Each structure stands twice: as structure tokens, then as C-alpha cells.
Amino acid sequence: KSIYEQYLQAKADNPGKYARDLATLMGISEAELTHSRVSHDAKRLKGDARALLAALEAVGEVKAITRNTYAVHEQMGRYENQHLNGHAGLILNPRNLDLRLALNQWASAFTLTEETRHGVRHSIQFFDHQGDALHKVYVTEQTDMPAWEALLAQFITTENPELQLEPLSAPEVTEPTATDEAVDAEWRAMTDVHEFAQLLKRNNLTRQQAFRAVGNDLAYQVDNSSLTQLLNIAQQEQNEIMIFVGNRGCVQIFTGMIEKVTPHQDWINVFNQRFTLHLIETTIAESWITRKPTKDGFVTSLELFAADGTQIAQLYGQRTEGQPEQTQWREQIARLNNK
């Protein structure tokens, strides 16, 4: 009868399924599922994700989890070097917790205390106005428990009002305005990778339309098995790469070396001491190599797309401002099979 009771049933009937997939089966958002777990193993937290994020600085090392349908990014680190604003904010800690955030998308927050076989798990979970997961923070061995308890004591509220869910506000524009040769020209004139965003906006283009518009020297397709090849090559050579995984409200950035790559069924997995990637390899519909110009030379990336055009993940070589990308990265990309 009750949504919680439905949840208990779905969990019993699907012992292999995470909160997210149990919500789908149940036909609700993950946020609304969490709302039903209040008074059981969850509590509502006082709004303003900016206030919760700022406060998380006090708790030291935690595990941050960001995902989309196709890719899960889990990263050890700390909520420091914060620059928070509504449209664009950052948690800037290269090789640790590196987030780009659109806080205007952050709507609700809950805390979970759940006993499991492995042991008690404590987490803070942020949801968007569609009730989808934006960001989760899990307590770890090094977490400052006094600070975490004082945070929860500050932010927990008795009032758990119904989630104000907002209808989808996807791009849904299409209508490419400018010409192919003009897009190719604008791309070759870029001095920084951040201009590429403004290029797509200015020319009312999707990334995959921009990628098809330009010359095969700037953007070309490679096999969808390309992600697994790169991961294994980086793992053998121990060079530093970047992995981006994003949703509508949060992008999480890994920088570091790949310690181990393990396939499992349809998943491709990276298991590091401080980072985990889970990606559904079989949902990669399009794999693009792009070369975008900067002051410091060309930056080469592998960009992965699902059949509906969802951005699974992007890979780059490690690079600081004023430094080129490594040749090693380019030579790894060069070993990937074109189409």
C-alpha cells in the first residue's frame, strides 16, 4: 500500500538492484523513494545545497559519487577549494575531489543510515528538481565523525514536505543555424577548450552535430570497444589521464593513473585505491576522438555517447594550464581503430 511498503517489496523481489533501479521499477524518482524512507533509515536536511556543500568542508576525507544512467564515478577526497555560484561553481582539488556544479539544478537533500552485510553505511544524497541523484557523499574510515555528527545535528529537520517535482526542461532545440564550414572555422579559431561550450550555444548545435559538421582532422569516430583499449593501455603504461562523468547538475573529474581494469558482464570497471569507475560498455553507441586547439596546442579527447545522445563520459590526457597534453596520450589515441 504505502510507497515505503512498495519499496520493501521491490527490494525483496529484486535483491540485486540499487535504490536508483528500484525507483524505476516503482515508477518514481530516487528522490521520492528517499522521501518515503524518512522515519525509517533516512532524514530530510534543511535546503540550500550551497550551505550543505560549504559545511562538508569540516568533515575531511569522504567518498563522493556522481553518475548518469550509463556511468558511475566514485572518488575519495575533501570538499575544499570551494567556489560556489548558481550557474557555475567548483570544488577544485585536482587528482582528488574535482567537481563542476550547476547548483540551480540542486533541489533536495537527505541523510541515510543503512546497516548492510558489509556494515553500516552513512551518506548525504542530493537530488535535482526531477528527483534524480546529483551527488552522494559516503562516510569512510578517515571521515571526521564528530564534524559529520555536528553537521547532521545542524541540518536535519523534522519537516519532510512533499518534493516539488518539475517537468523536464531538456535542450530540445535542434535547428542548427550556422554552416558546417563556419563551425569548422570557429573550432580552428578556439584558444581554450571552454570556448567549445559557447560554440555549441552560439550555433544552436549538439556535440554530435558539431562533431559531424567539422573536418575529420578535428573529429572522427572509432570502434565502441575503444574505451576498454585505452583503459588497458593506460593501465600498462601508468601515465596520468582524466575521466569526466556528468549529469545535468554535477560533473566529477578523475585525474590519475589506472591501477586495474576489469570487465564484468556488460560493465567495464576501473578499481583504484581512491577511485572507482563503473561504465555499461554495451550502451556506448558512438565513440568520438576530438582535437580542440588551445594556446598550449591541440587537446585530444575520447567522448562516449549513448543511442539517445546522452554523454556517458569523456577521457583526456593529464594537462595543467601552460603545458601541452603528453605525446604518450596522443600515441595511445593513435592506436585506436578508426570506425
Distance CA 280, CA 269 (A): 9
Distance CA 112, CA 91 (A): 23
Using an 8 Å Cβ cutoff, are 32 and 3 in contact? yes
Distance CA 35, CA 29 (A): 10
- Mapped onto helix, strand or coil, the DSSP state of residue 122 is strand
CB atoms within 10 A of CB 265: 7
All three cell numbers of 259, joined, read 591501477
Number of helices followed by number of strands (H, E) in the chain: 10, 19
Distance CA 261, CA 232 (A): 6
Distance CA 23, CA 17 (A): 10
Sequence letter at residue 215: G
Give the resolution in Å.
1.7
Method used for this model? X-ray
Using an 8 Å Cβ cutoff, are 103 and 86 in contact? yes
Distance CA 107, CA 105 (A): 6
Using an 8 Å Cβ cutoff, are 24 and 96 in contact? no
All structural domains of the chain with their residue ranges: 1-79+108-172+259-279, 80-107+173-258+280-339
Place of cell 554535477: 250
If residue 239 lies in a helix (H) or strand (E), which one and from where to where? none
Residues in CB range of 142: below 8 A, 6 or more apart: 60, 61
Distance CA 70, CA 77 (A): 23
- Mapped onto helix, strand or coil, the DSSP state of residue 314 is strand
Q: What is the DSSP letter of 231?
A: H
Using an 8 Å Cβ cutoff, are 70 and 310 in contact? yes
**Strands, E, within 30-105: which ranges?**
42-45, 62-67, 71-77, 82-83, 89-91, 99-101
State phi, psi for 240 to the nearest 5 degrees: -85, 125
Distance CA 36, CA 137 (A): 20
Q: What is the DSSP letter of 105?
A: G
Residues in CB range of 245: below 8 A, 6 or more apart: 66, 67, 68, 71, 72, 73, 251, 252, 277, 312, 313
Place of cell 545545497: 49
